[PDB]
Structures are given as structure tokens and as C-alpha cells.
Symmetry: D2
Subunit: 392 residues, 4 copies
Amino acid sequence: VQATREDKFSFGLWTVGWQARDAFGDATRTALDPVEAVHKLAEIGAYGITFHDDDLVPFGSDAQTRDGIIAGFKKALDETGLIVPMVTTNLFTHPVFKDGGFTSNDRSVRRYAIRKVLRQMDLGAELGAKTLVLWGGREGAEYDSAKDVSAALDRYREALNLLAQYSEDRGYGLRFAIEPKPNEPRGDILLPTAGHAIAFVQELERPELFGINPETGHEQMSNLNFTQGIAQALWHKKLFHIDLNGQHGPRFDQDLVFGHGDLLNAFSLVDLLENGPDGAPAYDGPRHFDYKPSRTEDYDGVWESAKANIRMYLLLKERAKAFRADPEVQEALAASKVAELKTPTLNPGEGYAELLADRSAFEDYDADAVGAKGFGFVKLNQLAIEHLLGAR
Amino acid sequence: VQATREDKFSFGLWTVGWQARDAFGDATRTALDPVEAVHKLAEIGAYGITFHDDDLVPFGSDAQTRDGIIAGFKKALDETGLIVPMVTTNLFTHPVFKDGGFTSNDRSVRRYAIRKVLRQMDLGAELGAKTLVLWGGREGAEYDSAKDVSAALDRYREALNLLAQYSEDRGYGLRFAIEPKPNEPRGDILLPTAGHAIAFVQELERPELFGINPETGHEQMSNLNFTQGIAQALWHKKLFHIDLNGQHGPRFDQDLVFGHGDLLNAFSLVDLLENGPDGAPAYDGPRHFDYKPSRTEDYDGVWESAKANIRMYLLLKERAKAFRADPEVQEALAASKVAELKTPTLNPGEGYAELLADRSAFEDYDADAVGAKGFGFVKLNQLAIEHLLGAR
Amino acid sequence: VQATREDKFSFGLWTVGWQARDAFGDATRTALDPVEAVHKLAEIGAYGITFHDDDLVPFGSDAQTRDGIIAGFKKALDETGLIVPMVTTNLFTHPVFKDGGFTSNDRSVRRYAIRKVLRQMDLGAELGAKTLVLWGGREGAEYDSAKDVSAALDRYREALNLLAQYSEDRGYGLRFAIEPKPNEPRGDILLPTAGHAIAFVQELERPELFGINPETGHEQMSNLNFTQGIAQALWHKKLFHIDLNGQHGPRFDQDLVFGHGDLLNAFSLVDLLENGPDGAPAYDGPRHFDYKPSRTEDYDGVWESAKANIRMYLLLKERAKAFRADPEVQEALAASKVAELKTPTLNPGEGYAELLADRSAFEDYDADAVGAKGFGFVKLNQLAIEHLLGAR
Amino acid sequence: VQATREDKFSFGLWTVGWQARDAFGDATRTALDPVEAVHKLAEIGAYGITFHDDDLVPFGSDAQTRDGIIAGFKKALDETGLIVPMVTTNLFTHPVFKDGGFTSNDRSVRRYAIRKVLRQMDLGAELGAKTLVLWGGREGAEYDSAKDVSAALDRYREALNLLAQYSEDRGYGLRFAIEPKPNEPRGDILLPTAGHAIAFVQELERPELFGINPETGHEQMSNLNFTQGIAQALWHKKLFHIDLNGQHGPRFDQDLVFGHGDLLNAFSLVDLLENGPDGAPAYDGPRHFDYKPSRTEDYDGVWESAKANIRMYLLLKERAKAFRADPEVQEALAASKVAELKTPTLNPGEGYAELLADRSAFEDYDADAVGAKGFGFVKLNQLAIEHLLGAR
Ligand SMILES: OC[C@@H](O)[C@H](O)[C@@H](O)CO
Ligand SMILES: OC[C@@H](O)[C@H](O)[C@@H](O)CO
Ligand SMILES: OC[C@@H](O)[C@H](O)[C@@H](O)CO
Ligand SMILES: OC[C@@H](O)[C@H](O)[C@@H](O)CO
Ligand SMILES: [Mg+2]
Ligand SMILES: [Mg+2]
Ligand SMILES: [Mg+2]
Ligand SMILES: [Mg+2]
Ligand SMILES: [Mg+2]
Ligand SMILES: [Mg+2]
Ligand SMILES: [Mg+2]
Ligand SMILES: [Mg+2]
């Protein structure tokens, strides 16, 4: 399998560029040049690159430096044909954001965090980015009495409403994607799951401009089913972007290559995104990898890991397609009544009164008899794993 | 401290009545008589009792039987002065519900599930209940290919819209509270956290009628901060009811007495619920205990465990109040800038244009200097714990 | 592929026989006749069957009844050629065991538990069983002050020493396997992981007769690496038996078909067991499936699920074999230096004196240059998964 | 209360000296001077200080500098009266240890790692340290095929045997304490729990010289009961040292102040360590705090957090003693039969022959009557908690 620009694989500059300085050790790799990253990614098949303001322009560069950097990066994109589908802002690294950006208890920090993002929005718009991802990594707490959650959601909302106002007024046409994470680096982060993030967005001034950027590992850190979470996000039409990676349950954020953590869930996920209604994907945006090349690797291992993400995604896609195309799967699906869930429970024009008058729905219903029929779900599941395994 | 009707402690018939038949062993206690339950609960200070249809009327009782039981029950309520603030429906025990009630793959089960709930709505209406709790315990799956989540949400929505229509046409005035649970009995349950449930409710036809019934242990099964999810629910104004109990992280659902699991979080929760806005509670509904007397206990143990729930709450309430009235705490709160979060980030009439014109919010902002000042959060936490321990 | 007696696949009578009564619902299936279970298992390729005393002979059956059941069971065995490689005792279902068997706080229960086991040893010995599995499911506590752990371990040891004595004196030649589990049904179970069980066994009077019976999902309930724990069990030479199944991290005990939980760990487990040192398997006992057919299934789903366990094991075995016979994998292993771990750190006859004298081990060691070399682990992991996916 | 030297509270230099650089952000505090650290800790009540070689002497320090630093340090200890009860070696920070120290796939690194420890043993013996703590933070893997566990355990053993040989021959009199941790920084670390570590130690050449150093947070990262594991550690007589801190279940290692995570388990732990048999503590070593002052704090917050550790331990101690001394508790303990567990199951001189002859242990045992009696565990738990809340 080979990647095409239509696959829409994107990578964050901070992914292949991670120097591997973890919580217990020093960096094991040297810094990666943005221009070189552009060339190497173009080379392995990516269609786009993303970055945090501070990944491209060192925090505190003068305008002369900032400008030179932007010019060079812009050239590289030019020469390679890579686009910038999304940009994000770093509101977590600098010590000033130790209690958050938008929700820091310190008012001055909140004013500053907003300005930092407005600026990144400008650059984003200039490079043609369409999505602004917001990962509130420091919004949250270690102790319950330290953060008024209500006040915090008010301030989170105040800040986002201004951002949409600005984008709309400047005609940027950005979409905003809130990225949920349950913990790390704060003891607990606000808007911990895809669900909490969706509920929150529904309360903004222009909710139509807002959605989520869920990440595989983030939902897995809570032992949640990532595919089912995405399915819900799709039902709401709030899946604006997606970060793919691997994780092994509730533990520190691993950021493994996509499919190197929960493989079975990685499979059902590609199936969901690609085998959409009427053949077409159910999702049209970037297939963004927010992962980290393991600390035990060098630059060779880095490029290898970048390609492993693409490989994993295309090998799974290939098996999801075959799963669905298999007449034996098709028969097991019918036996399990998976599609019967699509038929309304109620008949056309039927309401409570017609339902209450239907004796077959209650008075004459044989619950014991229906309760004994099997659904044949183990067999259908075994058919899926055999396709995954390349055994069918 | 002693319980008053104003404390609003309620218990489910199924809590003290749990015979302790678990996944690996037989029941260790004989059945509890409902009238007896009512009399005993009245005695320990409960102001209300709740029940699933099947807890009071054995599945399949003829109408004469059913009628007989309801009349005895109402009499016990009458004699003791206990009310029924909420009722619910058992859509999980009978084999017919093995794949769900409202979202079973089987259309006939779905129709039957609605009829079972309508019937319970009529009895709740009859007893004066104000809330209908819906715990979709069998809605979900063990395998990703077995359940079309999108269609499941459509059918979940279809069923709820009908229930609201009916209540509203008959003038029942019920409020509906969806109870989220991440797993057990299904590998994964639909609407797994408080967040997922709130996002869902915002998509119904009469949203104002729907909220959630979050459970301490259910959010903890995913390692989430219960107090923090309750704060968000309150922020959305969707906290319609609450189920209190104890749990020790992600493992099977323990249903311990409130405060016997994560005690620190039990403390911050009571503080949040009672030390509300004015001086008044932030929440006005029933403090419902959805717990189980451990399998090792006989009926003396059951009544002790019921009392323990009430004692934990009142003991926590007393320390929450003392914490807040402490001048040393007020001082720590001022140093940590907790209240500063409540002041808008922007000055009245300030927009993005005024923020961009403020050089002090960015160009002349000394991030380094601000990033060096500590928040004094540990100290504040330490004062909170010392209040919990009666050390101050 | 097809299973052979040489594969040594065994099933507990309680797996295919699970009536599917869970913590929240009634059984969805009727009881399975033991004789019929023997015939069906023989037919799908099992080499053996195992059972708890109470699975075969209903608790409290008079001697004539028991004798009768046993005789019919033996006939079925004879007729099919299946063996009974292991037997176990139910010390968890009856209310009497609510606080444990060997470690109940009540002395009379501890005496009765031992007698129940002696009786099962006799029957095991008569059926030719070589292993007695001990799963102390009720040994533990819900509350810290309710159980004296030190006293519990003494009582535990006291019971086990007696059983070994009896066995040795009767010439039964049994081997004893303790089965660890972290929780469920007790809040916390004694000897929670394979490590704790092994350390305990080392303190018995005759440690050589004792090992462990680790279960896939039990270690995963604690989010531990099952394969790595089996590796340590093998290092200690204490892997006496193994229970294979599937689990999705920390949550209730799911007991899915082997491979339907963490697929990547199932793969590396089959690799460890079969591609042992010297071509041959590293482990030769039974490959026992301790799982449960999902509650949504009927008897067809039950046999399908029984065959899925064997299929899963044989498919992974085939891929594990191909993995190792791949010259590219071999090249990647040499680059990752996996085998170099097997070479002693010290040279032959070298001690601390010689080591202290080797300047190349410290004084002239270039930590920094060594630290920059990559291990190629990601690429090796990618090749493993490509084999698993049948992509190579 | 007030800490005394008899309380034996110790802290590592790396605790209060943690600069607060986490996986997602820069240091928020300046470096702490070791002499100042000695002085500050002496002031708050610590009786000892501990450190990693690299905490004191910067990696790659010339002999002159190293010596310079030690001499200043010894003077500070002299002056303050603080001792060094334990020393440890950093085998996790430098890039050369990316794949481990003692079990690195690379043989040259294994040799270097032993040299680095030998050198710390010398400094430790010189400062009067009693225990050598060994935390194998990089021993493990991210991918199963990358590490031969059996070979890794051989090399781990090989290195330890040598260190013991050396210490014995130089007459240093050290005890070695292996510190288990389930994950972080490696995906999976070797010897993941207290159990696995004890089992391992039992396989060394001079096992009497090896024990464990369990850490509260480490066992909780796997959702295990810390108190119960320490109780097993004490039963085996392998509790050579203990690391105290707080954690909120399975997530990144938080390193909170002791008792700031699972408060109920912190209570039961203090009870176990202090209300030992013969009135006296069951444990007599250092009460060492391996925690981290939150990133949101300045140097004032740092000293506050250091003192919080001592206060938590002494407030808990005080309540555990009150608890045991309460007559109502004594009554509850009796009804729960906690002490009956200490009486042998068998009468003195009884063996299996006499047990088999006792009809009252089986044939005439009424399991049903015994199964109906409750143990009063909830009431007992409720009393423990009221004691912790200062409510009695
Ligand atoms: O957990 C880290 C987060 O995933 C970030 O990579 C965001 O996506 C970008 O700030
Ligand atoms: O996990 C069990 C659930 O909490 C139920 O008790 C509901 O609250 C009512 O069906
Ligand atoms: O968790 C259930 C246990 O694994 C049992 O199946 C034992 O293996 C035997 O009693
Ligand atoms: O999680 C890290 C470890 O706990 C260390 O602090 C050790 O105890 C000393 O290497
Ligand atoms: Mg991440
Ligand atoms: Mg991300
Ligand atoms: Mg509930
Ligand atoms: Mg519950
Ligand atoms: Mg099991
Ligand atoms: Mg088992
Ligand atoms: Mg430690
Ligand atoms: Mg730690």
C-alpha cells in the first residue's frame, strides 16, 4: 500500500520533532529543522503539516527572526506541495501557564493567553489553515478547592466567544476544535472526555463554528471505547479533526504509533471512518497522527515510525473493506440484526396512543420466548478478527 | 448530627433490599418486605423511597396482585409520611433485555421496552413522583461490529421524545434524568459519562425536560473527578438528581456507602452541593443513596449501612461548613486567587479590538516574572484535609 | 487449521456451562448436561475437561446421587477419550464462604473449607488429575480493618501445608497451582497478582509442589503485561497451569474468548509459549480456556465461542512461527540486540576487582556516544504486527 | 503535633529539590542548593536526607569538584545532626540508560551501570548509609519482542549478586531494597509490583541481604491495595524501606504529599505500621517521603508541602491510636471475629487424619446456618472513618 494526497495523512511538527526528553530523562535526539521535517514528510507521503506557534518560532523571537522563519517554512511548503490544514497554540509549556491559559486563576495570564492565540490565528489564516485546535492541557487542578469549575467554564467560554468573533470579523473562516484529555499534566483537566467537550461547545455563542479534536490515547486513558466515542461525535456532527495514536489503557500518555496500542479498537475505528454511508468515508478531514517516536530511537527510527503510522492505517483500511465485502460477514450481520436497529421503533405516524393500543407490544408479548434467541455476536466478532488477521 | 426531612435523604428499595447474590455467589440475605422497608427507612430519617417497577411488583404479577401491592405500599407511605421523589424501570434483568431495552437490535424488544416505561410513568404520576430516572444498563455492546452506535442514538432519542410527549399531554410534569455508566453489565455502555449524557440530551425535542442522574461510583469507574463532573453538570443546569455511593477506582461497581471509597472527593462534593452561591445549597434535589450493603452483612448490617450513608453526609457537611468559615482558609483562598477566576477576563465593553490595543496583555507582558509566583495550592489543600480530619 | 490432542486445549465445565446470570440479570441459557458437555468438547478438539466439585455434583447431593453422577461422567470420558488434567473446588458460591474459605475470620468455616478440598482431591486423584487449582476468590476484604493479612497468610499457609501432606502421604502426586486475582468478588483479594502468589508459594513447607495458575484477564484487571508476567513465572519455573481468556483493561472480569481482549499481548503470549528455547515450547501443560460465552448468545453461540478460542490460539501460533522464520525479523532482532541480553555482563571469571579495573567500563566509557545510538525497537514492533496482520 | 528524631522522617534531595519540569513544560523553580536543603529539612523535623549520586554531584564532575561537593555536604550534616539512612543511584536520566541500566540490550551499558552503582556504594558506606535503594526505572520495554524477560531477570540477578559480594567483602554492611513500579517511564517496567519484587529477591545468592522499597503511588498506579501489600511485605520480612506519597489511581505518577491521594488507605497504612504487635510499631525503618511539591508552587509552597507530609503522618497516627483504644471499636472487632483469624484452623497436634475424623467439620456441618450470620464489617468500617474524621 502507498499513501496518496487523498488519504490526508498529516503530522504535527512536534511529533517527528520530539527530542525525547520525558519526565525522567534528558533528550536522546537532536532538534529537527522545520524545513527538513517538511521535506521528509512530503517524502513519506503526508499531505500536510501542523504545528504549535512555539514549535516553529521559538518563544520570544523578535519579529525579524519570526519573519525569517516563516518565510523559509513557507518556501518549503511551496516546493513540496504540503499544506497546513490546522495550527494550534502552545498554552502549556511556559511557566506562566502553570495554572492554565484561558482558566488560570490569575487574570493577567488569561488576557495574555488570548493574545497568544489571536496571533497564532493570524499566522494560521495566512498559511491557509482551516482548523484551530485548542488543547487546554493546563486547564484544571491537582486539588479540588483550588479551582472553581463553574467560573472556569465561564472564562473558557468568554475566551472562545472572542476568538470566533475575531475570526468571523476578519473573514478567516476557521473552525475551532476543542481537544479533550482527562489528565496529564494537571491532576484532572477540565472537559475530560469527547462527551464533556461536546456538551460545553453547545453552550457557546456560535456553536456551529465549534467541534472537537478527540485523540485515541486520551479517551483510552479513561478506559473508554474510542470508536464508540467517535461514533457519538459523528452523530452530533462535531468531529472537526482527529488525532490518531496508540495507548495501553489508563497510565501516562504513551503516544505510540496508531494501532500499536489497542489494535482491535484501531480496526473498528478505521472501519467507522472509511466504510461510511453509501461507500464514502463517514469522515472527510485530516487523518492526523499526534504520536511520538519512542525515546529508544534515533532519526532512522523516527522516519520509520512516521511511515509505520501510514502503514497501520492503510493495512487496517484494507481489512475493514474486505470484512464488509465478505458475504459471510453480510450473513452474520443479518443474523445479529445489526441493521434492524436502523428501522424506527415506531411505525409511521404512530404515537403513544397507538402504541398503548398494540397488545403485541406488551399484553401479548412473549418476553421469555424472545429472551431465549441468541444474537450470534461472538461469531460475527470472530469473523472480524479473522479478516484483521488476514486469515479470510 | 441527626437527619431532618429538609436534608432530603432518599434510598432505593433495591439498596437495603439487595439480597447479595453477586456474579460469583448465592444470596446471603432473605427478601425485604417493601412495607417493612418503608417503616425502617422512615425510622432512620429518610424523607423518601424510590423503586424500579420490578422491585415492588414482581415481574409478571396479574393486575389483582399488582393492585394489592400498590395499595399496601401507598398505605405505608401514608402512615410514615414518606414520599416517592423518583421512580425508574427495570430494563436490565429480564433475558429479553440482554441486548438493551430502547436500543436492542431486535425491534420488538424496543417496542416492549417503551410500553414497560409508560406503565411505570403512570404509577410514578399516581404516587406523586417528580423524576423518571432512566439507567440504560444493557444499551451498548461487547464487540464493536455488533452495535451501530449512530442508529442506537437515533432509537434512544426516538424513545425519549415519545416519553416526553406522553408526560406532557397527560400533564404529569415529570423531569427525565439519564443515568450514565461506562461499563458493566455490557463491555461498553452507550452514554458512558456525565458529559456524553449531557451532550445527548441537548439533541432531544424537549431538552428543557431532560437532565442527568450521575452516580459517584460510575464516574470513578473511569477514574474521572466526580466533584468536577458535578460542577460542570450544575454549570449546564442539568443536575436533575444524584446517586451517591462509594467506589475504589476502575474495577467492578462496588456500591459502597457514600464516603467509604474516595473520601477526599466525597468531601469536595458535599462542599460543592451545600456551600452554594448565596450561602444556600447549589443543589435542591434529593440526596439519593444508590448503594449496596456488603454481602458479608445480615439485616443488622443492612440498617447500619443505611444509617452510615446519612452519617457520612452530615459529618462531611459539618466539616465543609467549618472549612469555609475559617479565616485561615479565607486567607489561603485569597493567596491562590480562587475568586479572581470569577472576574471576567475582559473589562466591560472590551472586545478583541481593545484587547489587541493593550500592549500590557502581550508586547510588554513579563511572562517570566508572573510564571515565578506560586499559587499556594498545597497549603490550601492541607487546610482542607485538616478540617476533614477534625484537626482544626 | 485443526486442533490435535497434542495441542492440549482444555475447557472448564463452568465455561461452556455458564448460564449467563450476571450481577444485573437472570440466566439467558438453560443448564448444560455434563455428559453432553464432554461429547461436544471432544467434538471440537478439546483434549480435556476440568470442573469444580460443585459444577459436576450439585452442592449437597447425597452419596448415591454423587456416585451416580460420577459414574456417568467417567463413562462419557471413556467413550470420548477426553482426560481430566486438573480439578478445582468451589470455595466461593455458598453463603458460608462470604468472608473466604481458608481465610474466613470464622474458624469453623476454615475447617469446613479444608474438608471440602480434601474430598475433591480424592475425586481428582481417582479421575487422574495431576493439578489441583486453588482460586481463593473470597479470601480478602472490602474494608482494611476487617482482615488481618498476616493472620490470613498464616492460615492460608496452614491449609496448604496440610493438603500437600495428605497428597504426598496418599501418593496422589498432585501439583498445586494458586490462581491470583486482584479483586472481584471481594473489594481486594489476597495474593492479587502472579508476583504475590509466587512469593507466597516460596514460603510453604514444600514449595516444590506449588506453582501458579495465572489468568489472562486477571493480570489485565490490574493493567499489567500478561506476557511479561508469564515470562517471570517461567523464569521461576512456577507456571504449573494457565487460564487463557480476553479482557479490556481494568473493569469487571469479562472472560472473553482468548484473543478478543488485548490482541497484541495474546500474540506475544503465544510466541513466548510456543517458540520456547530449543525450537520447542517453553511450556508443556494444558492450554486451558477459562472464559464465558457472552450473555447475548444461545447454545449455537456457545459452541461457536468454544471453537473461537482454539481458532484464535492456532492462528496466532501460525503467525508467531512465521514471525521468527523471517530473515528480516532476524535482521531487526540483531539490530535491536535482543540476544545480546543473554550474554553475561561479566566476562568469564571476571569479578568486581577486574570490573573495577576496566577503564572501558567507566573511566574511558563514552556514555554520550552510546546514548545516541537507536535500538530500532519501533521497526521490530512494526514487523511483528505486519506478521500478525498477515501482511508479511 | 511535632516531629521528633524518633519518628524517623526522611526526604530525598530530589523531592524538595524538584524544579518542576514535567513531560509538558519547563521548570518553574530554580535549583535548590544541597546545603540549604540540609538546613531547611533539619528545621522542619526530618532526621535524615537521601539522594541519588547525580542529585548531589552533577553528572560528569571532575574528582576535585566531586570531592569539593561531598566535603561541604558532610559539613552541613555535621552541623545539623541529620543522617543519610539510604542512598540510591541514578540509572534513568542520561540517554545511555534509555533501554535500562542493568538490563540494557547493550552489554557495554550494563557494565557501565554496575560501575556507577559500585561508586555510589562507596560514597554511601562513607556517609554511613544502611540501605542501597535500587529503582530500575528504565528496566522494561514499550514492545514485547524487544526484551527477553528471562535474560533480563538473569542479568538483573547477575548484577545484584556482584553488588552483594562487594559490599560483604568491603565490610559495608548494606541491605539492598528493590523498588517496584508498574510503568513510567517505560511502557512496562520489570518487577512491576511489590509481589514480583519479593519473588525475585528470593532467587538471589544472598537473599537475606535483599528486601523491597515499595512506594504508595506505585502500587496504586495498578489499583492495588497499598496497606495489604505492605502487610504481605511484613509477613515475608522484606520491608527494608518504604516510600510514602499520594496518588489518584491509575494515571501518571503524581507524587502528591502522603495522604493527599487515597486518604482511607493512608489511614490503614499508618495503623499497620504503628499499631504493631506488642503495642509497638510493626516497622522500625525510615518513614521516607518520595513526593514532589506541585508545579504551581514556589519555594514557600515547597517548604509547606514538606511539612504537610509530616503533619499528615502524625495526624493519622494520632487517630489510628484513638481508634484501637476505643471500646466500641474493641466490641466491633470482636463481633467481626478479626482476632479469631489468629487462632490456628487446626487444634494443636491435629493433622489431616484427625480433621477427616471430625464429622463436625463436614458431615454434620450446617453451612446454611453459618452462612446466615453477618460479620459486622460495615459498622467496623464506619467507626474507623469517624475516628479518622475526629467525630469520636
Ligand atoms: O496530550 C498532548 C496533546 O495531544 C497535544 O499534542 C495537542 O493535540 C496539541 O496541543
Ligand atoms: O448500576 C446500577 C444503577 O445505578 C441502577 O441502580 C440505577 O440507578 C437505577 O436503575
Ligand atoms: O475469576 C474466576 C476464576 O478464574 C475461576 O474460574 C477459577 O479459575 C477456578 O475456580
Ligand atoms: O518513580 C521514581 C522513583 O520512585 C525514584 O524516586 C526512586 O525511589 C529513587 O530512584
Ligand atoms: Mg497525547
Ligand atoms: Mg493531540
Ligand atoms: Mg444509580
Ligand atoms: Mg452502581
Ligand atoms: Mg476470571
Ligand atoms: Mg481462572
Ligand atoms: Mg520511590
Ligand atoms: Mg514515583
